[PDB]
Design a protein around this motif. Structure first.
Motif, mmCIF file in Angstrom:
data_model
loop_
_atom_site.group_PDB
_atom_site.id
_atom_site.type_symbol
_atom_site.label_atom_id
_atom_site.label_comp_id
_atom_site.label_asym_id
_atom_site.label_seq_id
_atom_site.Cartn_x
_atom_site.Cartn_y
_atom_site.Cartn_z
ATOM 1 N N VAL A 206 20.444 -12.250 -9.588
ATOM 2 C CA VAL A 206 19.171 -11.572 -9.369
ATOM 3 C C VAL A 206 19.142 -11.010 -7.956
ATOM 4 O O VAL A 206 19.187 -11.758 -6.971
ATOM 5 C CB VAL A 206 18.002 -12.525 -9.625
ATOM 6 C CG1 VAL A 206 16.699 -11.903 -9.146
ATOM 7 C CG2 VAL A 206 17.922 -12.870 -11.104
ATOM 8 N N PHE B 261 18.406 -15.216 -16.361
ATOM 9 C CA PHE B 261 17.571 -14.172 -16.933
ATOM 10 C C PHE B 261 18.425 -13.098 -17.594
ATOM 11 O O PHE B 261 19.640 -13.024 -17.402
ATOM 12 C CB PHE B 261 16.672 -13.542 -15.863
ATOM 13 C CG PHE B 261 15.724 -14.509 -15.231
ATOM 14 C CD1 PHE B 261 16.101 -15.247 -14.124
ATOM 15 C CD2 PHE B 261 14.456 -14.690 -15.753
ATOM 16 C CE1 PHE B 261 15.228 -16.142 -13.543
ATOM 17 C CE2 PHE B 261 13.579 -15.583 -15.177
ATOM 18 C CZ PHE B 261 13.965 -16.311 -14.070
ATOM 19 N N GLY C 145 13.701 -11.726 -19.809
ATOM 20 C CA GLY C 145 13.319 -13.118 -19.718
ATOM 21 C C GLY C 145 14.491 -14.004 -19.354
ATOM 22 O O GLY C 145 15.600 -13.549 -19.063
ATOM 23 N N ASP C 146 14.229 -15.306 -19.373
ATOM 24 C CA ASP C 146 15.246 -16.305 -19.087
ATOM 25 C C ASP C 146 15.874 -16.805 -20.382
ATOM 26 O O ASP C 146 15.441 -16.469 -21.487
ATOM 27 C CB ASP C 146 14.658 -17.478 -18.297
ATOM 28 C CG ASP C 146 13.703 -18.313 -19.120
ATOM 29 O OD1 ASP C 146 12.678 -17.766 -19.579
ATOM 30 O OD2 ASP C 146 13.978 -19.516 -19.310
ATOM 31 N N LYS D 205 7.761 -13.620 -5.301
ATOM 32 C CA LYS D 205 7.291 -14.996 -5.334
ATOM 33 C C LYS D 205 6.484 -15.260 -4.071
ATOM 34 O O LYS D 205 6.905 -14.885 -2.969
ATOM 35 C CB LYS D 205 8.456 -15.978 -5.469
ATOM 36 C CG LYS D 205 9.546 -15.494 -6.418
ATOM 37 C CD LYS D 205 10.695 -16.485 -6.512
ATOM 38 C CE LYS D 205 11.487 -16.286 -7.795
ATOM 39 N NZ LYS D 205 12.462 -17.387 -8.024
ATOM 40 N N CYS E 162 5.556 -16.487 -9.083
ATOM 41 C CA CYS E 162 5.650 -15.063 -9.390
ATOM 42 C C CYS E 162 4.357 -14.509 -9.955
ATOM 43 O O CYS E 162 4.206 -14.235 -11.114
ATOM 44 C CB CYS E 162 6.755 -14.538 -10.291
ATOM 45 S SG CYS E 162 8.028 -15.786 -10.610
ATOM 46 N N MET F 103 12.258 -9.132 -5.390
ATOM 47 C CA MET F 103 13.526 -9.175 -6.108
ATOM 48 C C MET F 103 13.362 -8.420 -7.423
ATOM 49 O O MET F 103 12.263 -7.982 -7.777
ATOM 50 C CB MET F 103 13.971 -10.623 -6.329
ATOM 51 C CG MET F 103 12.810 -11.590 -6.487
ATOM 52 S SD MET F 103 13.340 -13.305 -6.584
ATOM 53 C CE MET F 103 14.686 -13.302 -5.401
ATOM 54 N N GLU F 104 14.467 -8.274 -8.150
ATOM 55 C CA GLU F 104 14.463 -7.485 -9.373
ATOM 56 C C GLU F 104 13.829 -8.256 -10.527
ATOM 57 O O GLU F 104 13.889 -9.488 -10.594
ATOM 58 C CB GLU F 104 15.884 -7.049 -9.745
ATOM 59 C CG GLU F 104 16.875 -8.180 -9.972
ATOM 60 C CD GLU F 104 18.136 -7.715 -10.688
ATOM 61 O OE1 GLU F 104 18.014 -6.973 -11.686
ATOM 62 O OE2 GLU F 104 19.248 -8.086 -10.252
ATOM 63 N N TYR F 105 13.212 -7.508 -11.440
ATOM 64 C CA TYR F 105 12.536 -8.064 -12.608
ATOM 65 C C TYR F 105 13.463 -7.960 -13.815
ATOM 66 O O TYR F 105 13.686 -6.865 -14.344
ATOM 67 C CB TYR F 105 11.222 -7.330 -12.863
ATOM 68 C CG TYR F 105 10.633 -7.559 -14.238
ATOM 69 C CD1 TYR F 105 10.054 -8.774 -14.578
ATOM 70 C CD2 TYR F 105 10.651 -6.553 -15.195
ATOM 71 C CE1 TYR F 105 9.511 -8.981 -15.836
ATOM 72 C CE2 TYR F 105 10.111 -6.751 -16.453
ATOM 73 C CZ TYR F 105 9.542 -7.965 -16.768
ATOM 74 O OH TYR F 105 9.005 -8.162 -18.020
ATOM 75 N N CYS F 106 13.999 -9.100 -14.248
ATOM 76 C CA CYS F 106 14.867 -9.157 -15.422
ATOM 77 C C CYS F 106 13.983 -9.063 -16.657
ATOM 78 O O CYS F 106 13.366 -10.047 -17.071
ATOM 79 C CB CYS F 106 15.689 -10.439 -15.408
ATOM 80 S SG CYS F 106 16.517 -10.748 -13.832
ATOM 81 N N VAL G 151 9.592 -8.098 -8.944
ATOM 82 C CA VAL G 151 8.759 -9.283 -8.843
ATOM 83 C C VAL G 151 8.776 -9.744 -7.398
ATOM 84 O O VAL G 151 9.666 -9.401 -6.618
ATOM 85 C CB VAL G 151 9.218 -10.424 -9.774
ATOM 86 C CG1 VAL G 151 9.247 -9.956 -11.219
ATOM 87 C CG2 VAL G 151 10.577 -10.960 -9.330
ATOM 88 N N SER H 155 13.891 -19.337 -22.823
ATOM 89 C CA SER H 155 13.077 -18.678 -23.838
ATOM 90 C C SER H 155 13.919 -18.262 -25.038
ATOM 91 O O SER H 155 13.443 -18.300 -26.177
ATOM 92 C CB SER H 155 12.364 -17.469 -23.235
ATOM 93 O OG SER H 155 11.399 -17.876 -22.282
ATOM 94 N N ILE I 140 3.844 -14.523 -13.793
ATOM 95 C CA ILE I 140 4.840 -14.978 -14.756
ATOM 96 C C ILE I 140 4.926 -16.499 -14.734
ATOM 97 O O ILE I 140 4.764 -17.154 -15.769
ATOM 98 C CB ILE I 140 6.216 -14.345 -14.478
ATOM 99 C CG1 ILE I 140 6.056 -12.880 -14.068
ATOM 100 C CG2 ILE I 140 7.117 -14.468 -15.697
ATOM 101 C CD1 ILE I 140 7.369 -12.170 -13.813
HETATM 102 C C1 LIG Z 1 9.255 -14.752 -11.480
HETATM 103 C C2 LIG Z 1 9.772 -14.951 -12.683
HETATM 104 C C3 LIG Z 1 10.757 -13.834 -13.168
HETATM 105 N N1 LIG Z 1 10.596 -13.188 -14.357
HETATM 106 C C4 LIG Z 1 11.415 -12.189 -14.790
HETATM 107 N N2 LIG Z 1 11.282 -11.554 -16.120
HETATM 108 C C5 LIG Z 1 10.758 -12.400 -17.171
HETATM 109 C C6 LIG Z 1 10.996 -13.731 -16.989
HETATM 110 C C7 LIG Z 1 10.523 -14.650 -17.882
HETATM 111 C C8 LIG Z 1 9.816 -14.227 -18.987
HETATM 112 C C9 LIG Z 1 9.330 -15.333 -19.929
HETATM 113 C C10 LIG Z 1 8.617 -16.457 -19.143
HETATM 114 N N3 LIG Z 1 9.196 -17.206 -18.008
HETATM 115 O O1 LIG Z 1 7.503 -16.722 -19.467
HETATM 116 C C11 LIG Z 1 9.565 -12.869 -19.190
HETATM 117 C C12 LIG Z 1 10.044 -11.946 -18.267
HETATM 118 N N4 LIG Z 1 12.405 -11.808 -13.994
HETATM 119 C C13 LIG Z 1 12.603 -12.376 -12.775
HETATM 120 N N5 LIG Z 1 13.516 -12.160 -11.788
HETATM 121 C C14 LIG Z 1 13.286 -12.986 -10.784
HETATM 122 N N6 LIG Z 1 12.247 -13.739 -11.084
HETATM 123 C C15 LIG Z 1 11.801 -13.380 -12.321
#
Ligand SMILES: */C=C/c1nc(Nc2ccc(CC(N)=O)cc2)nc2[nH]cnc12
Length: 238
Positions: free
Chosen positions: A63, A131, A87-88, A32, A17, A81-84, A30, A91, A12
């Motif tokens: 998170v 996120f 996105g952030d 890191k 990540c 950690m959890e995957y949001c 996810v 974006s 990512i």
């Molecule tokens: C490690 C990064 C991370 N990503 C997510 N989901 C997600 C984040 C960003 C994007 C768009 C981008 N940055 O390009 C799409 C999906 N969730 C997370 N939680 C903790 N770290 C992350």
């Protein structure tokens, strides 16, 4: 509790990540990759204290941290950690600018409420460190410099959140400058445009109150929540 238990879907953001799926259940998370190979025992204690602190917080609007993994053959610590999946926020701002559409006031209220709850928990921060989950719920995780931080209290976070919400509304920070000294001057001047007129006077009032120069004029975490503008559905809904 090993890097071999997880599969890597893609990267990512390069720490770096990766977005991982656990073969056992199939869960999306996810990690890191922080490589300590170039770190002495000095970095070890500080990093482990950081891990202790991060893996302890259990709040819906932050998170969630889960596991720690070591592959000494790679000297790269994996922090899980959890995957949001949404996105952030940076974006979201990028998508708003690129489609000439402003974000819904209800969504700005969601972010305001949930981030205020997260900050209150942290007491007891950019569009890229925030996120969204599938329910468009706001998670916090690892231009915005405060007046006092540049001449560090709880109200400094209030100021930072005010800048974040302003940027969500107007699709640009409250203070735009080319040089750093020009930024500090625009800040100490303490003046900025009103958020778009699509937004209520009340949202603008709370955001402006967060951006007061004098720290003792910004709303406490609770005065923000005591506001008639914040309703129930702005809260994190599982
Ligand atoms: C490690 C990064 C991370 N990503 C997510 N989901 C997600 C984040 C960003 C994007 C768009 C981008 N940055 O390009 C799409 C999906 N969730 C997370 N939680 C903790 N770290 C992350």
């Amino acid at each position: 509790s090993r890097a071999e238990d997880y599969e890597v879907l893609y990267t990512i953001g390069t720490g770096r990540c990766q977005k991982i799926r656990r073969k056992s259940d199939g869960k999306i998370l996810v990690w890191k990759e922080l490589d300590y190979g170039s770190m002495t025992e000095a970095e070890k204690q500080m990093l482990v204290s950081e891990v202790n602190l991060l893996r302890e917080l259990k709040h819906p609007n932050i998170v969630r941290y889960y596991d720690r993994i070591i592959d000494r053959t790679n000297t790269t610590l994996y922090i899980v950690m959890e995957y949001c999946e949404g996105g952030d926020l940076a974006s979201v701002i990028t998508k708003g600018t690129k489609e000439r559409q402003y974000l819904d006031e209800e969504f700005v209220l969601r972010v305001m409420t949930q981030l205020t709850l997260a900050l209150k928990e942290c007491h007891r921060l950019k569009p890229a460190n925030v996120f969204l989950d599938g329910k468009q719920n706001v998670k916090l995780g690892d231009y915005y410099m405060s007046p006092e931080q540049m001449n560090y209290n709880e109200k400094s976070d209030i100021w930072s959140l005010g800048c974040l919400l302003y940027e969500l509304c107007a699709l640009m920070p409250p203070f735009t400058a080319f040089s750093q000294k020009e930024l500090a001057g625009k800040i100490r001047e303490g003046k900025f445009r009103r958020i778009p007129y699509r937004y209520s006077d009340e949202l603008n009032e709370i955001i402006t109150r967060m951006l007061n120069l004098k720290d003792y004029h910004r709303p406490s975490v609770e005065e923000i929540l005591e506001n008639p503008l914040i309703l129930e559905h702005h809260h994190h809904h599982h």
